[PDB]
């Protein structure tokens, strides 16, 4: 039942939206610089997410049409890592450090789940047919939209106050994620018309469970990082 | 029993040993500082190799005996990333930079195969039985031993000249690499399907290692002046 899979995604989304980290990020009584304290944590993810789209999801030598739809989808998501680096500099988090200090930060044990999220997604997606890969992408995009709907609230506050163009923790990022390329069909529209077998349904349920459990593990690391570095607020500069 | 697989590993090793990068690293007529120009490239691998042993290979919740032998083997290999960071500082490569520059370096397109080698190994090993995981580990350890037999030649030269204790590009690292996995493979009978999969494993591991070494060669050519800068005691 693909109707049950897409509703399972909504059920997982509704539970995921209630995590304490998002209540903190959406709280406008706290300065947006303190709500974006978790921003450096995304460095263990953002470029690994670029590689996930470049090299794991994508298969340019494929003739299958559903794979080509996945390929078109990766072309958009593989651009967002430069947006992350754009806002990293604007937030005053692109700090100078020793090369090994940058390595120890990315591979910190406190960012374990953040760093291996795309890795675990790639392992889960490797032996899947294209329509089952779409379930992974749809669940992953659903969790990501919950995150960036929240992060865009302090990001757009800093962007208007400092008069700087933010690209990652911004509404334009959310709107691009919500939409899709002109001329291509929606992955969700393809899923709504797809009939799954009993074996596919069991694998699809496992996919949704794992994607949101791993996203929840990541968000837990964001919370603990904010608690452990509560003074390391963002330091943007006005234009 | 599995003699063809262990011989295939030996054939791939002998072919792998002849790559031009290793001839460059073993040439003592070139200063060891110039032969270790490729050392920063390992930043895209060494810590990913730590995670590979910690989280992909290792399975502490397993009762299988072959998996426990893998778990013990990962406890040694998961320590070597700190050795890499040690020799990184000694060689004068632990330089100061912006956070994004370090990110752009690791995820450089010129280090693609270096960066995703452990990732591709993990993807290959995930659905394998423990004895088949051992085939992956054995081929990977054989290629790594060819790498560090070579790098230890200029590394020990700098270690002797500067009287500093190197840990990664050093003989002590090679000696640790050299309950055995190899003994289990010799006593294991594979099915026809298992043997065919083991051939695929060996081909992929050494092909991916060859791509990594190819990136090391192009990096040395592109940064021929950025020789190591170690200091004497
Ligand atoms: N829109 C995100 C993609 C994304 C998708 N899912 C995500 C999760 Br779960 C956590 C984080 Br942090 C990021 C994502 C990006 O462009 O990097
Ligand atoms: N002895 C290496 C492990 C290793 C095993 N295989 C390797 C290959 Br192929 C390339 C490189 Br660079 C390193 C390895 C280490 O501890 O980092
Ligand atoms: Fe995005
Ligand atoms: Fe090692
Ligand atoms: Fe080893």
Numbering used by the authors:
A (entry chain A): 0 to 238
B (entry chain B): 0 to 177, 184 to 238
Sentences from the paper on this structure:
Here we report a third nitrile biosynthesis strategy featuring the cyanobacterial nitrile synthase AetD. During the biosynthesis of the eagle-killing neurotoxin, aetokthonotoxin, AetD transforms the 2-aminopropionate portion of 5,7-dibromo-l-tryptophan to a nitrile. Employing a combination of structural, biochemical and biophysical techniques, we characterized AetD as a non-haem diiron enzyme that belongs to the emerging haem-oxygenase-like dimetal oxidase superfamily. AetD seems to be dimeric; each AetD protomer has a 7-helical-bundle architecture, which comprises three core helices that house residues responsible for coordinating the diiron cofactor, and four auxiliary helices.
We obtained a snapshot of AetD with a single iron bound (Fe1) by expressing the protein in minimal media with Fe(II) supplementation, and then co-crystallizing the purified AetD with the substrate without any additional Fe(II). This substrate-bound structure with a partially reconstituted cofactor was determined to 2.3 Å resolution, with two protomers in the asymmetric unit. One protomer (chain A) has a single iron bound at high occupancy in the Fe1 site based on an iron anomalous difference map. First, for chain A, the single iron (Fe1) is coordinated by H79, H172, E176 and the substrate; D76 is positioned similarly to the substrate-only structure, but now makes a hydrogen bond with a water molecule that is also coordinated to Fe1, attaining an overall octahedral geometry. Core helix α3 is more ordered compared with the pre-cofactor assembly state (that is, substrate-bound-only state); there are two additional helical turns in the segment D170 to T177; T177 to I186 is now ordered as a non-helical loop; and the Fe-bridging ligand, E176, and the Fe2 binding ligand, H179, are ordered adjacent to the Fe2 binding site. The density is improved for the Fe2 ligand E140, and, together with D76 and E176, these three residues form the Fe2 binding site. Chain B of the partially reconstituted active site structure harbours two iron ions. When we set the B-factors of these iron ions in chain B to be the same as Fe1 in chain A—the iron ion with the lowest B-factor—and refine the occupancies, we find that Fe1 in chain B has a similarly high occupancy to Fe1 in chain A (~84%) with the same ligands and coordination geometry, and that Fe2 has approximately half of the occupancy of Fe1 (~43%). Fe2 attains a square pyramidal geometry, coordinated by E176, D76, E140 and a water molecule (w2). The only missing ligand is H179, which is in the disordered segment (T177 to I186) of core α3.
